[PDB]
Design a protein around this ligand. Structure first.
Ligand SMILES: [Mn+2]
Ligand SMILES: [Mn+2]
Ligand SMILES: [Mn+2]
Length: 430
DNA sequence: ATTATGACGCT
DNA sequence: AGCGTCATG
């Protein structure tokens, strides 16, 4: 009753750029705007691998992970932009720099947690309190929410998309008790007003469109963000969770799309998140562990406590390249040359990071895959990172991995290497 | 032969 | 520390 906590204390948003790398290329090249287009890495093998797809191209069935030659079978007029190549490898600097543009705008509204190159969580609880005390009981006008969907509405007793959006928003705003400065539904609504302002600022100042979710925690905000893309935002209220989850496949919730979610489905004999409510917390902990079990028990009721961490910058800076098949590295000269290429890119990114962010990495992690190993990383080893020098970094990486060469001769490398990875970690204030 | 990352949990 | 899982631009 009055003591069963409901996880409605916070207002959390998730802002995610629409087809981010495509928008970066469309800003640069106006000929790609409002076109089916995709961004690719490399070109020789099957036209390159697609990593981002405009919504026009998605309508034709084009997806990430598709080879461009196959995409062109679905969409013959598909336009392609290629990721820059530097030192023999894909270079994603343009998109990291665009990401920083967006993150700096978001940070003007609230402290953010960078979750990926194109998305960030926002804790809006305090900004919402401020805007509410500024409003002093004045209701919220639909005009302040021009791109907002209210999940679950309209309901109860026009055949256009925008018309339904407005119908749902009108039902929501009529139901609102705008006199209660502590009503969670009102708090979410003001949160959505702020997120409209943040998304307007991002588009005005960068040209980039985004979507967003507003709810009481990170998982619901992420899920909400996906419900109405592109260029829209969605409010998922605490009350909307039972209906939403009653037909939600377990795999759609962040962290359940892999082996654990498959085991929830198989062990419990269920398919939808709502079905988790029938198990006790101890039952779920017995199957899935203390932490997972408690998390599932609360999450299926809409409750999750993971904080929005104050972290705008990545914790690690890394450089990786695969060498599939005939391109696998089979000589020590090859291995050394590619370690040097990766280390030169790493040095350049690290030096810029130290100037921009007043910090230095102190640990170098070297990861490799040997041909014939199914695991994505065959071996991972750390060493000290004491100088931002690519030649020293690559020599140290070689020292750390040279024991893996099973070749009797030192000129050859066996089994050949199918991936190299250098990662700088353990940052300290400079 | 989706590839280039990056966060985080486990032991 | 090194390995596994999850996400996916
Ligand atoms: Mn996105
Ligand atoms: Mn994203
Ligand atoms: Mn995506």
């Amino acid at each position: 009753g009055p003591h069963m906590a409901t996880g409605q204390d916070r207002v959390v948003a998730l802002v995610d750029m629409d087809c981010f790398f495509v928008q970066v290329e469309q800003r640069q090249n106006p000929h790609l705007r409002n076109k089916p287009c995709a961004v690719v890495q490399y070109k020789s093998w099957k036209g390159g691998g697609i990593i981002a797809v405009s919504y026009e191209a998605r309508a034709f069935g084009v997806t990430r992970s598709m080879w461009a030659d196959d995409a062109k079978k679905l969409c013959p007029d598909l336009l392609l932009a290629q990721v820059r190549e530097s030192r023999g490898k894909a270079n994603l600097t343009k998109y990291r720099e665009a990401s920083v543009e967006v993150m700096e705008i978001m940070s003007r509204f609230a402290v953010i947690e960078r979750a990926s190159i194109d998305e960030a969580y926002v804790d809006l609880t305090s900004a919402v309190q401020e805007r509410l005390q500024k409003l002093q009981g004045q209701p919220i006008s639909a005009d302040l929410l021009p791109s907002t969907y209210i999940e679950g509405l309209p309901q109860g007793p026009t055949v256009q998309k925008e018309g339904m959006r407005k119908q749902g928003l009108f039902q929501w705003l009529d139901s609102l008790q705008i006199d209660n400065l502590t009503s969670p539904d009102l708090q979410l609504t003001v949160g959505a007003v702020i997120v409209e302002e943040m998304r307007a600022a991002i588009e005005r100042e960068t040209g980039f469109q985004c979507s967003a979710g507003i709810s009481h925690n990170k998982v619901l905000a992420k899920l909400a963000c996906g419900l109405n893309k592109p260029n829209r935002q969605t409010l998922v209220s605490h009350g909307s969770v039972p209906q939403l989850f009653s037909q939600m496949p377990i795999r759609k919730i962040r962290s359940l799309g892999g082996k654990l979610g498959a085991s929830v489905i198989e062990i419990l004999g269920i398919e939808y998140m709502g079905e988790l409510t029938q198990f006790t917390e101890s039952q779920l902990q017995s199957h899935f562990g203390e932490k997972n079990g408690s998390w599932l028990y609360a999450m299926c009721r809409g409750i999750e406590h993971d904080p929005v961490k104050p972290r705008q910058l990545p914790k690690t800076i890394g450089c990786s390249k695969n060498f599939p098949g005939k391109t696998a590295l089979a000589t020590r000269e090859q291995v050394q040359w590619w370690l040097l290429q990766l280390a030169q890119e790493l040095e350049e990114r690290l030096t810029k990071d130290r100037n921009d962010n007043d910090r230095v990495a102190t640990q170098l992690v070297v990861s490799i895959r040997v041909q014939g190993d199914k695991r994505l990383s065959s071996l991972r080893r750390c060493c000290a990172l004491t100088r931002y020098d690519a030649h020293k970094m690559s020599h140290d990486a070689f020292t750390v991995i040279k024991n893996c060469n099973t070749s009797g001769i030192q000129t050859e490398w066996s089994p050949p290497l199918t991936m190299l990875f250098l990662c700088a970690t353990k940052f300290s204030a400079s």
